[model samples]
Target: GSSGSSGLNRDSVPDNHPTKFKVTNVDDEGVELGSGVMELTQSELVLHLHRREAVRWPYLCLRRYGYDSNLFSFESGRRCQTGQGIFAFKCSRAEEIFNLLQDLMQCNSINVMEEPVIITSGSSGSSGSSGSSGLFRLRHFPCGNVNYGYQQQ
Candidate 1:
């Protein structure tokens, strides 16, 4: 039994293996939390961090995702019990994974028709009011302690 001929479609050869990517989870501050595996299935996007609970987000639940330089990140619409937040990662193959996700999500196969929003760092939005009052702002007193010179009567 030595049939070496194989078809173009891998699905016909054996069990169709799911697509997955290796990534290192990081914080917004560039601190690596842990390394993990990201899997893309028909049902959801699964992230299994070493020694940590796996985070699963259905295609419909994916709100935003992007890859900047070697950093890849994503946010889910569904909030978790541990507080809703963005999951950033240090991924060298960010472009490849991001493109794959985009293609799969954009295709007719996935139920979600709208592609997930891609995030990018651009523009400097005004950082709230920076007005400092004279009372609060240190101008004259170098050793400015509130009661440094004055004593209670």
Candidate 2:
């Protein structure tokens, strides 16, 4: 796989307001943003989805938050990790989750080392440039917002 950008400007995603979107869990062989729904004191200010799904068929939030400890934390941008077996999110929808979290937690762009990186790539492969049939080591940049402690309920 080669390196590239899909031209998705995080700022252009309309993340200026927490009400723009919401975080929910609905994976059809994958994570669906406009899908499922479902909690915690540690979950304060974590997310404000466009429409927080109702409890009945709730979307299970699987987004993980934390940073790798090291000197370059200042150099490595933000990070997200969620490995729920075969389920995952793809493209701007993933970014929508991160941005929604960012807005909910009120993250400032000033402290970011660079762009935020989602831990896994979902079903949509037309987005990033990934390698062929081979194994590659993944890295977690500085989690700058360790104190944020955003987790699934």
Candidate 3:
């Protein structure tokens, strides 16, 4: 009751089918600072919930009228195919993940400050008038060392 290459004879084929896929360790590549897990097949990359404690896997659909709620209806299918199917995130939880990754990766800290200065200019005309203006400038300081060194495991 199936179609297209289903129930085909394997031994008669010219090429052997793949049994196991290779998994590349991404630990030293960069910071895996997201609340989702990455799955790679020979064909594509898929992201899904990493664990129950992740607390930010939007694929779990914790909100009202979540992704799961739209799985069956017409509008639901459209939403899943378009928006919800792409990226998933819990904003608050994502912040936590980002901070954790920053610490693990030993990222540099940046400090920023704003200083306000006032300038007054006198305008001389037929009727003499004076004008005043105020402005603020922002300054940024990178306060920590940044080294790009990592080994692939």
Candidate 4:
């Protein structure tokens, strides 16, 4: 009881605890949308658009999010329900966003986390890695409406 220590590894740490992590808003051209490198958190996502304006979404407030055609939509942030842009953008990295949050959700032992999750936007991969083999390389089948049923890698 006198001495104290905490054993931890990067794999054991949660994603949101880190101060600097990558987040990007990808455009319809399949590139980084808006102005610059956008850092995200479990609590909020910052969307920057033309004409010098900013839109922020609270992840916790989200009811649901899904992809249609090229545009990804996040509903239930009470944004549309609360009268914001009710915006729709091509969020090609939707899965990456999911994994980031999933990591936070699965963080029974986390609190530093990464692994080419779902999609990191700015990433221009035409196809995902087919033979992923890491514990964090989330494998899932789309159950429609952004509901991913995962299989451990």
Task: Score every model by TM-score.
Answer: 0.54, 0.23, 0.16, 0.37
Q: Residue 147 deviation, candidate 4, in Å?
A: 4.3
Measured on C-alpha atoms, candidate 4 has an lDDT of 0.41
| CA RMSD of each candidate after superposition | 19.6, 14.7, 23.9, 16.3
Q: Which 10 consecutive residues of model 3 have the lowest summed lDDT?
A: 69-78
Candidate 2 residue-wise lDDT, 68-146, digit = tens: 2211011111221222221222232344344444454434322323346557544533334544321121333233443
Candidate 2 segments exceeding 4 Å error: 1-63, 66-92, 106-153
**How many residue pairs clash per model?**
0, 16, 0, 5
Q: Which residues of candidate 3, in runs, are more than 4 Å off?
A: 1-88, 107-153
* Best of the candidates, lDDT: 1
Which one wins by lDDT: 2 or 4?
4
TM-score of 3: 0.16
68-110 per-residue lDDT for model 4 (tens digits): 4334444443333233222334433545555564554344333
Task: Report the lDDT of model 2 for residue 6.
Answer: 57
The residue pairs in collision within model 3 are none
What C-alpha lDDT, on a 0 to 100 scale, does residue 59 get in candidate 4?
Answer: 54
Q: What is the lDDT of residue 60 in candidate 3?
A: 19
The Cα local distance difference test for each model comes to 0.52, 0.30, 0.25, 0.41
Instruction: Please provide, for model 1 over 106-150, each residue's C-alpha lDDT reduced to its tens digit, 9 standing for 90 to 100.
Output: 553433223444544555543443352210111112211111111
